[PDB]
Amino acid sequence: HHHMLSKQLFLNRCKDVEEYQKAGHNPWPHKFNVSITVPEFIAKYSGLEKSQVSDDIVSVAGRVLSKRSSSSALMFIDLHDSQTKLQIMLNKSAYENKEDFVSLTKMIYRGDICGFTGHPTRTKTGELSLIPISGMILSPCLHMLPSMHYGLGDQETRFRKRYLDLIVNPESVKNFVLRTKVVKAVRKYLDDKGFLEVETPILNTIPGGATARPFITHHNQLDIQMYMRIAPELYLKELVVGGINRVYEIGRLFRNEGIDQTHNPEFTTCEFYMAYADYNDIMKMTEELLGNMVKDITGGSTKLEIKKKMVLDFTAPFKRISYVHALEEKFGEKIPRPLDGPEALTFLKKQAIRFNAICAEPQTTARVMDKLFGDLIEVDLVQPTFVCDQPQLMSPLAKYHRSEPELTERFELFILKREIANAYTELNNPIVQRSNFEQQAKDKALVDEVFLDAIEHAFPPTGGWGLGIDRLAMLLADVDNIKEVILFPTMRPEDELEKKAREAKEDAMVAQEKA
């Protein structure tokens, strides 16, 4: 008889509410006027001393998380609003309608949304409270709210029912408040520099040259197959061709791939493009922006993190290293020239066995170089640091470096062994761009001719920048799971087995109480 006690509680709770309404009480009043929020309440009335009572009449509202009474004429309620608590001392003598007092104080169930109107006070016990002249049920709770706290970790139950989690684990709200703080920070930073915030299509008739697997859908009237975007890059660049010199979008991208702690099916990034700027400029901008964020969080530009503690030093400037130069620094000496040549490869392999003791197949120069960099220096790069001037071997769609050969003009910002952002001195040569697109298409086995036309019409020298929003929030909230900063992460639909098991344990809880 799976989940019997919870169905019983639900049924009886519905009965309670209907009887409450039959007695002439509306369980769902249309409007209650809240004059003050409990954080505001606390801010204003904290100066009250013990047993002192204000003359003011205020009204507050929130969720009842605690209901306990030392008397039938004296009840104490923990009312929760904006993740903050205020006690409600329901004292009968101070309650105007002495008839409503009984029915109300009897009806109130833990989890109910209630309003109260009365006098601020600080009790003799020191507890800041409100003494109600009147009060009412604003919305009844028809289930048993889990204890506080509940589900730690047990990410499943948490992220299934985010609405319960936010209630029993209110600390979690701190994360999401941080995340919005982040996007505002970037918006401001860019807006104040003349950037136009735009919106580009999420649906495209062209799949995109990137190897990433896309979500595929269908438009009925046009009878055509369409694809969800992997990045806004092309459209934004078209905007820079069109005369809008500085654009950015903070948008939702979609990858039809796996789900792990650093990957959600749909995620959020910021891209911007800025005419007449290069990756150096973007480097200083990145320093500036991230610095501002961290100082907003703390006051200083040094943040504290776990592993107990440690400090990430966001102080400008960030350290910066050259790719192949760091590889050669730790190797012992240089890599043979033509890096994409055979001698360079046979060289690299010798270090692949000497050092890494790890590598993979196919053994292209790019991939051995990538694994080499991957566990030789990429781990670890804990402090914020720019890795710059990647080879053409690694960078197919980038612009060649202006001084030293076989390198390109990019960087990837590493923090805590992870990539957070990246930038480019964008390739604006339309002939080379065409070659690269046709080559890309060939390796993947239609190409974006609209975009090619656009930059054939002259694309200004431009700086490009991309930031992972979810991952930056992850890094700044000090969490190791991306679902911790996404409100409703994508969940594998729970079938009957774990559904039954879950509801079963939920009832096993109630049994753990009643016996």
Ligand X SMILES: Nc1ncnc2c1ncn2[C@@H]1O[C@H](COP(=O)(O)OP(=O)(O)NP(=O)(O)O)[C@@H](O)[C@H]1O
In the complex, the smallest distance separating the C-beta of residue 486 from ligand X, rounded to whole angstroms, is: 9
The interface with its own copies within residues 107-136 (CB under 8 A) comprises: 111-113, 115
Q: Report how far residue 423's alpha carbon sits from residue 415's, in angstroms, rounded to the nearest whole number.
A: 15
Contact 85, 149 (CB under 8 A): no
* Closer residue to its own copies (CB): 53 or 452: 452
Best CA proximity match to 63, nearest among 166, 134, 132: 166
Instruction: Give the one residue of 91, 175, 200, 269 binding ligand X; rule: CB under 6 A.
Output: 269
Q: Is 389 in the site for ligand X (CB under 6 A)?
A: no
Q: Is 97 in the site for its own copies (CB under 8 A)?
A: no
Contact 307, 287 (CB under 8 A): no
Calculated CA dihedral for residues 308, 314, 317, 319, nearest 10 degrees: 40
In the complex, the smallest distance separating the C-beta of residue 23 from its own copies, rounded to whole angstroms, is: 17
Please choose, out of 41-49, 97-105, 124-132, 211-219, the segment that lies near its own copies by the rule CB under 8 A: 211-219
Tell me which of its own copies, ligand X, none is bound by residue 147, counting a contact when its beta carbon lies within the kind-specific cut-off of 5 to 8 angstroms.
none
* Closer residue to ligand X (CB): 112 or 484: 484
Tell me which of its own copies, ligand X, none is bound by residue 468, counting a contact when its beta carbon lies within the kind-specific cut-off of 5 to 8 angstroms.
ligand X
The pair phi, psi for residue 3, each rounded to 5°, is 60, 25
Instruction: Give the one residue of 92, 160, 181, 255 binding ligand X; rule: CB under 6 A.
Output: 255
Please choose, out of 21-29, 321-329, 357-365, 381-389, the segment that lies near its own copies by the rule CB under 8 A: 21-29
The interface with its own copies within residues 169-198 (CB under 8 A) comprises: 170, 173, 176-177, 180, 183-184, 191, 196-198
Contacts 24+ apart (CB under 8 A), 278-284: 278/409, 278/425, 278/461, 278/463, 279/388, 279/409, 279/410, 279/411, 279/423, 279/424, 279/425, 279/463, 281/463, 282/411, 282/423, 282/463, 282/464, 282/465, 283/318, 283/320, 283/386, 283/411, 283/423, 284/317
Joined tokens for residue 469: 């929003």
Instruction: Give the one residue of 2, 28, 300, 343 binding its own copies; rule: CB under 8 A.
Output: 28
In the complex, the smallest distance separating the C-beta of residue 30 from its own copies, rounded to whole angstroms, is: 4
Dump the DSSP string for 67-85. EEESSSSEEEEEEEETTEE
The interface with ligand X within residues 475-494 (CB under 6 A) comprises: 482
* Closer residue to its own copies (CB): 105 or 172: 172
The interface with its own copies within residues 350-389 (CB under 8 A) comprises: none
Count how many Cα atoms sit within 13 Å of the Cα of residue 44 in the half-sphere of its side chain: 17
Give residues in contact with ligand X (CB under 6 A). Answer: 255, 262-264, 267, 269, 419, 468, 470-471, 482
